[PDB]
Amino acid sequence: SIMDRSEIVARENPVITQRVTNLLQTNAPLLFMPIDIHEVRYGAYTLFMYGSLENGYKAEVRIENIPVFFDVQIEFNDTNQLFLKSLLTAENIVYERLETLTQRPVMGYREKEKEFAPYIRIFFKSLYERRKAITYLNNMGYNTAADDTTCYYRMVSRELKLPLTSWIQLQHYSYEPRGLVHRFSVTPEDLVSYQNDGPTDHSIVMAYDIETYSPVKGTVPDPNQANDVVFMICMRIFWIHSTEPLASTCITMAPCKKSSEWTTILCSSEKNLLLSFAEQFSRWAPDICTGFNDSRYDWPFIVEKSMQHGILEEIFNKMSLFWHQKLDTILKCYYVKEKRVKISAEKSIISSFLHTPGCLPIDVRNMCMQLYPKAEKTSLKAFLENCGLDSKVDLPYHLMWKYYETRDSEKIADVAYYCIIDAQRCQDLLVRHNVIPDRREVGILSYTSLYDCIYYAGGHKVCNMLIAYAIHDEYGRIACSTIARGKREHGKYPGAFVIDPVKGLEQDKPTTGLDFASLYPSLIMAYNFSPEKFVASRDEANSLMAKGESLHYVSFHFNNRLVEGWFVRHNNVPDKMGLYPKVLIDLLNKRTALKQELKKLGEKKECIHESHPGFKELQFRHAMVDAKQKALKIFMNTFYGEAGNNLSPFFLLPLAGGVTSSGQYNLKLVYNFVINKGYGIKYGDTDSLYITCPDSLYTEVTDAYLNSQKTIKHYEQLCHEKVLLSMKAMSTLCAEVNEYLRQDNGTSYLRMAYEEVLFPVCFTGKKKYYGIAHVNTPNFNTKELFIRGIDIIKQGQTKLTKTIGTRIMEESMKLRRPEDHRPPLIEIVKTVLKDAVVNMKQWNFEDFIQTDAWRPDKDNKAVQIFMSRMHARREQFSYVIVEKQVQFDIQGHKMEYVSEAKAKNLPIDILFYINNYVLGLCARFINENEEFQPPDNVSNKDEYAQRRAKSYLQKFVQSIHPK
């Protein structure tokens, strides 16, 4: 009595499914959209891809007659052909045919008449033989190309221009229906990539939730333990772009009252529950699988239970769409365990799941972690409150165990609703953060499947894009390798030019920040840092210089060894431009066009309200263009990181060394040129200069204050005039420096940009400053502050600190007359602290709702003392069995001594909280004083100043605080 997927998609979209049927009955071209890709290794090579049609039917497309091949560099003569054939046949390796061709290498520079090199291509039949042949040939060390080993669908994608993550137009096919699945058979010549923007997607995402039981209270159920039994399963299906559910299903052990919004299926044992789960999965057949915390608690538990009961084969066979399989094969290959997913350079996550063909499994928690690598809290409620979506039901877990063990119907129905909402939260997050379209656009731009775009790093994507642009060059074919060759040296790069900042607060002269617009890509474009234009020997460089070609020279010092190198320039000629400049310039042109398009679309949208019938398509267009520009940004910023990696097959130490050296040289040249003109430098870092205006420009308006009435509005109008004059001078300086760089380097690809004016300013350490913004016109009554480095963001630990720090900064940055007083950033801290110490009543019980649940209740730092105290008080509300209880703490006074939210007045000893929390932030605010510098014999400097500055401030506050 459960509707199939076909019935649902027919009921929801009548006209579209009618059109699809009419097109199907007459062998007409059709649109297809892939999700998951699977391939067969042994035997003949056939590529399987699963996906959706326009209306919602599930489709399987199988590609045959895909040629499998790889290249080698020897000669064209038949003698070497026979020698290679004998070497291959030495250990029973099958081959089909050999071909010969010509193409260009990637390493080294060759003259115009010798640019092409001869290759021999070997064709095979199964991937096993190809992999073994590549391994053996590299074992004797032959320079081979097109050497993809781990995955092969990438080569097929880049060799045919088939964006596996976008729409595919298919015609001239063979069609066979089978129940719910429509089998298509095609050939490589019958597929086209759909260049036009396509209609809306109609895939299916299913969210599942599981609730299990453990006889022993206070412990997390263990899969290895046979006492644990599952009792609650919830399934929901949604569209890829909508929140309203299409259907829901409920499976329970104990009987429950029926509900209007879902259907329930009764069971009798563990076997029945698992078989019902498999049957419902087969009936719906979803494309994407999801559920929060399914990576180490849901999937391994269910697979362990299935293995214990010995029903894994049947459930897996009903799960997937592939041929029949055996249990050992399922355990060995299709079940992944301890998979590593990388977030940042220091964070990684373990994952485990079951990969049934025809459905891609994703974990929402991992995606949220990747989107927010700096999130301090790792809870679902934290993500819900950060994303701004509606919060879930605050139902404690021990309530669910108690209500399950009470064995009543309506309460289990209520917890069923609770877990349904918990499941829906995942799809809420996925739609809110726009994960699928973003990863889809990245895959389209990178020629890679969706599974790799969601589970792997980003360097391989940039390598793949580089190879894709390399193969289809319009002046020839360029052959790029994939396996790394050469010794892996380790060391540190030179450079790191640093200029010391001028400490303190400035309110007499304003400062302005000049920035470099994408320094490293600009340098790559300007100086031709491409591997195909590299010369190593000095004699060759001298010969080419004699010939008449301009060159660029790089030299540095790596691992106590002097490294030299030469590069060939292009002097603004499209023919002689290299590969990296080509790819960067193409990306830049695409980005500029997309920016213009989105600006025009937004200008149109600002005149259109949201109640138009056609607003939905405009919103979809806006979202798509935003995703596209984001993907362009991420590749353009990750390119340099990929290029310098020591594991990349394109690595060259001279390239990275020269890039860094050129950056340092250009920074030094600009700094020296600015000094020569009479201006002053206040800060400098890699690609930014914070500079100042000379005094002689400010004289005239200054005299106005000398003979004025010296009121507040006088000083205000002096401030306005000073800001305007600073802006006027800075624009001209930026123009002049751009002209100087253009005349020096010879190309206009490198330029310096003007963003903002800051006055007054405060610099309190490296990469730490704050001030008042001024975009175009002066304003001083604004409350917004420009903050960099100092991070008053965290509020879970405390929230009074935020108010006190905001008050400190606001008091410190206000403009003052030159004749009242100039407190050197210490009297401000003193005044604010003494004000805070006195008159306690001007705070209230708002930030004092901190909680720390002692769920383990057995091993922790100090919460066990509080637990023992409350247990003794109860034995002498209880809230003792609530391990996951969010109870507020109020230290109404050096050993914990916290109190519950339910309490009498109990005056708060604010000294404990201040000395625990705010002194650290204040020290970080003031730690960079010159008085507290450490002597040279001390190894650690930051902790030195931090510790003794905090100690000084704390002890002096204690002294001034009466006791």
* 415 and 543 inside one domain: no
Q: Are residues 69 and 152 in the same domain?
A: yes
* Segment 37-41 long-range contacts (CB within 8 Å, at least 24 positions apart): 37/153, 37/164, 37/449, 37/451, 38/322, 38/357, 39/152, 39/153, 41/126, 41/127, 41/128
Gap between the Cα atoms of 553 and 532, Å rounded: 16
- Collapsing DSSP states into helix, strand and coil, what is residue 573? coil
Q: Tell me whether residue 86 is in a domain.
A: yes
Please tell me the distance from the alpha carbon of residue 579 to that of residue 142, in angstroms, as a whole number. 25
Please give the helix or strand (H or E) that residue 213 lies within, else none: strand 204-213
The span from the CA of 584 to the CA of 439, in Å, is 21
Q: Token pair for residue 352?
A: 């485990």
Which of the listed residues 364, 398, 433 is the one where a domain comes to its end?
433
740 and 707 assigned to the same domain: yes
Distance separating alpha carbons of residues 325 and 524, to the nearest angstrom = 52
How far CA 780 is from CA of 361, 694, 777, in Å, comes to 53, 23, 10
Bridge partner residues of 788 (DSSP): 769
The answer to whether 478 and 579 have CB atoms below 8 angstroms apart is: yes
Same domain, 158 and 236: no
CATH number assigned to the domain comprising residue 2: 3.30.342.10
- Kindly state whether residue 524 falls inside one of the protein's structural domains: yes
Tell me how far apart the alpha carbons of residues 592 and 585 are, in angstroms, rounded to a whole number: 11
Of the candidates 223, 396, 230, 389, which has an alpha carbon nearest to the alpha carbon of residue 308? 223
Helix or strand or coil: residue 535? strand
Residue 32 parent element (H or E): strand 30-39
Burial class for 5, CB neighbours closer than 10 Å (0-12, 13-18, 19+): buried
User: Last residue of a domain, which of 727, 761, 790?
Assistant: 790
**631/218 Cα distance (integer angstroms):** 46
Least Cα distance to 458 among 627, 641, 632 occurs for 641
Query: For the CA atoms of the chain, what is the radius of gyration?
Result: 34
| Three-state secondary structure call for residue 792 | coil
Structure tokens at 252: 């329970």
* Residue 244 in domain: yes
Q: Tokens for 359, please give them.
A: 């459905």
| Cα 467 from Cα 158, distance rounded (Å) | 8
3-state secondary structure 303-326: HHHHHHHCCHHHHHHHHCCCCCCC
Q: What is the spatial distance between Cα 418 and Cα 396, in angstroms, rounded to a whole number?
A: 11
Q: Which residues of 713-742 are buried (b: 16+ CB within 10 A; e: fewer)?
A: eebeebbebbbebbbebbeebbeebbeebe
3-state secondary structure of 591: helix
66 Rama class: left (phi>0) / alpha (psi -120 to 50) / beta = beta
- Resolution, rounded to a tenth of an Å? 3.3
In angstroms, rounded to a whole number, what is the distance separating the alpha carbons of residues 76 and 630? Answer: 47
How much helix, strand and coil, in percent to the nearest 5, is found in the chain? 45, 20, 40
Q: How far is CA 73 from the centre of its chain?
A: 39
CA proximity to 673, closest of 739, 768, 583: 739
Q: How many domains, the chain?
A: 3
Residue of 770, 757, 759, 767 whose CA lies nearest to 825? 770
- For residues 549 and 671, state if they share a domain: yes
**Whether the Cβ atoms of residue 689 and residue 671 lie closer than 8 Å to each other:** yes
CA 808 to CA 806: how far, in whole Å? 5
- Asked if residue 297 and residue 175 are part of one domain, the reply reads no
- Among residues 769, 750, 753, the alpha carbon closest in space to that of 761 is found at 769
Tokens of 66: 């895909």
The whole-angstrom distance between residue 920's C-alpha and the CA centroid of its chain comes to: 31
**826 burial level (CB within 10 Å; 0-12, 13-18, 19+):** exposed
User: Are 774 and 758 spatial neighbours (Cβ–Cβ below 8 Å)?
Assistant: yes
Rounded CA-CA distance 271/310 in Å is 10
Map residue 331 onto helix, strand or coil: helix
Strand (E) positions, 40-97?
47-52, 58-63, 68-72
Cα Dmax for the chain: 102
Beta bridge partners of 193: 168
Query: Residue 215: inside a domain, yes or no?
Result: yes
Contact between residue 229 and residue 305 where contact means Cβ atoms under 8 Å apart = no
CB 582 within 8 A of CB 533: no
| In contact, 729 and 754? CB cutoff 8 Å | no
User: Which among 108, 103, 388, 422 has a CA at the least distance from the CA of 292?
Assistant: 422
Burial of 489 (0-12, 13-18, 19+ CB in 10 A): exposed
Does residue 856 fall inside a structural domain? no
Which of 483, 515, 542 is a domain's end point? 483
Give the closest residue to 331 by CA, choosing from 297, 300, 361.
300
Q: In degrees, to the nearest 5, what angle opens at C-alpha 362 toward C-alphas 2 and 391?
A: 80
How far apart (Å, rounded) are the C-alpha atoms in residues 288 and 299? 15
Instruction: Report CA-CA distances (Å) from 248 to 79, 260, 424, 628, 799.
Output: 69, 11, 10, 34, 41
Q: Is residue 864 part of a domain?
A: no
Helix (H, G, I), strand (E, B) or coil at 957: helix
Q: Which residues pair with 234 in a beta bridge?
A: 209, 250
CA distance 238 to 436: 14
Whole-angstrom distance, CA of residue 195 vs CA of residue 185: 23
Cα of first residue to Cα of last residue in the chain, in angstroms, is 77
Answer yes or no: are the C-beta atoms of 493 and 657 closer than 8 Å: yes
Residue 908 domain-assigned? no
Measure CA 103 to chain center. 37
Give the separation between CA 484 and CA 647, rounded to whole angstroms.
7
| Continuous segment of H or E residues that includes residue 120 | strand 117-124
3-state secondary structure 599-645: HHHHHHHCCCCCCCCCHHHHHHHHHHHHHHHHHHHHHHHHHHHHHCC
Q: Which two tokens stand for residue 485?
A: 């060759």
Q: What is d(CA 192, CA 29) in angstroms, rounded to the nearest whole number?
A: 11
d(CA 937, CA 934): 8
Contacts of 962 (CB under 8 A, 6+ apart): none
CA distances from 776 to 281, 754, 755 (A): 59, 12, 10
Determine the Cα–Cα distance for residues 161 and 824; give it in Å rounded to an integer: 65
Residues whose CB falls within 8 Å of the CB of residue 857, separated by 6 or more in sequence, listed in order: 218, 864, 867, 883
DSSP 189: G
Q: Distance between CA atoms of 503 and 96, rounded to whole angstroms?
A: 73
Is 68 in contact with 125 (CB distance < 8 Å)?
Answer: yes
**Integer Cα distance of 810 and 789 in angstroms:** 17
The distance from CA 625 to its chain's CA centroid, rounded to whole angstroms, is: 18
Cα 498 from Cα 685, distance rounded (Å): 7
DSSP assignment, residue 26? T
Query: Are 121 and 495 within 8 A, CB to CB?
Result: no
Is the same domain home to 166 and 286? Answer: no
- CA 924/CA 946 separation, integer angstroms: 7
Residue 717: which of 701, 703, 699 has the closest Cα?
701
For strands 58-63 and 752-758, give the pairing: unpaired
Contact 251, 265 (CB under 8 A): yes
Residues 477 and 491 in one domain: no
- Give the distance from CA 59 to its chain's centroid: 31
Beta bridge partners of 515: 688, 753
Stated as kind and residue range, the H or E segment containing 732 is: helix 712-745
The three state secondary structure string of 666-708 is HHHHHHHHHHHCCCEEEEEECCEEEEECCHHHHHHHHHHHHCC
- Beta strands (DSSP E) in 255-393 are 263-266, 288-290, 335-342, 348-354, 360-361
Residue 130 CB burial class (10 angstroms; 0-12, 13-18, ≥19):
buried
Q: How far apart are CA 749 and CA 526, in angstroms?
A: 6
C-beta of residue 567 within 8 angstroms of C-beta of residue 529: yes
Looking at the fold, whether 18 and 45 belong to one and the same domain comes out as yes
Q: State the CATH number of the domain containing residue 507.
A: 3.90.1600.10
Q: Which residues pair with 263 in a beta bridge?
A: 249
Residue 394 vs residues 621, 758, 885: alpha-carbon distances, Å: 37, 46, 11
Identify whether 832 is part of a domain.
no
Same domain, 237 and 154: no
Element (H, E) at 35: strand 30-39
Measure the CA–CA gap between 478 and 468, rounded to whole angstroms: 10
Handedness of CA 88, 93, 96, 101 (dihedral sign): negative
Read out DSSP for 45-112?
A: --EEEEEE-SSS-EEEEEE----EEEEE-S-SSHHHHHHHHHHHHTTT-----EEEEEEB-SSS---S
Tokens of 702: 């200054």
Please answer whether residues 306 and 359 qualify as being in contact, where contact means their C-beta atoms are separated by less than 8 angstroms: no
Phi then psi dihedrals of residue 184, to 5 deg: -115, 145
Closest listed residue to residue 737, CA positions, set 686, 669, 682? 669
Q: Which residue has the tokens 């889809």?
A: 440
Pairing of strands 561-568, 688-692: unpaired
304 and 248 both lie in a single domain: yes
Whether 677 and 534 share a structural domain: yes
Of the candidates 705, 963, 698, the one whose C-alpha atom is nearest the C-alpha of residue 837 is 963
Q: What are phi and psi of 127, to 5 degrees?
A: -70, -25
Tokens of 39: 């391939």
What DSSP string runs through 468-505?
A: HHHHT-TT--B----S--S-----------B-----EE
> How big is the chain, counted in residues?
963
CA 16 to chain centre: 36
CA 559: distance to chain centroid? 33
CATH code assigned at 318: 3.30.420.10
Measured between alpha carbons, how far is 239 from 721 in angstroms, rounded to an integer? 58
Contact 358/52 with Cβ under 8 angstroms?
no
Token pair for 123 = 């064709």
Tokens encoding 639: 């390119």
DSSP summary character for residue 846:
T
Are residues 853 and 880 in contact, defined by beta-carbon separation less than 8 angstroms?
no
d(CA 46, CA 619): 40
- The structure was resolved experimentally with cryo-EM
Q: Is the peptide bond before 649 cis (omega within 30 degrees of 0)?
A: no
Distance CA 682, CA 465 (A): 41
What is the C-alpha to C-alpha distance for residues 580 and 188, in angstroms, rounded to an integer?
30
Distance, CA of 377 to chain centre: 17
Q: How far apart are CA 511 and CA 759, in angstroms?
A: 7
Strand residue runs (E) in 722-859: 752-758, 761-763, 769-771, 786-788
Amino acid letter for position 258:
K
Distance of CA 33 to the CA centre of its chain: 25
Domain extent, residue 785, equals: 484-569+636-790
Spatial separation of the C-alpha atoms in residues 916 and 33, rounded to whole Å = 57
The values of phi and psi at residue 831, to 5°, are: -65, -45
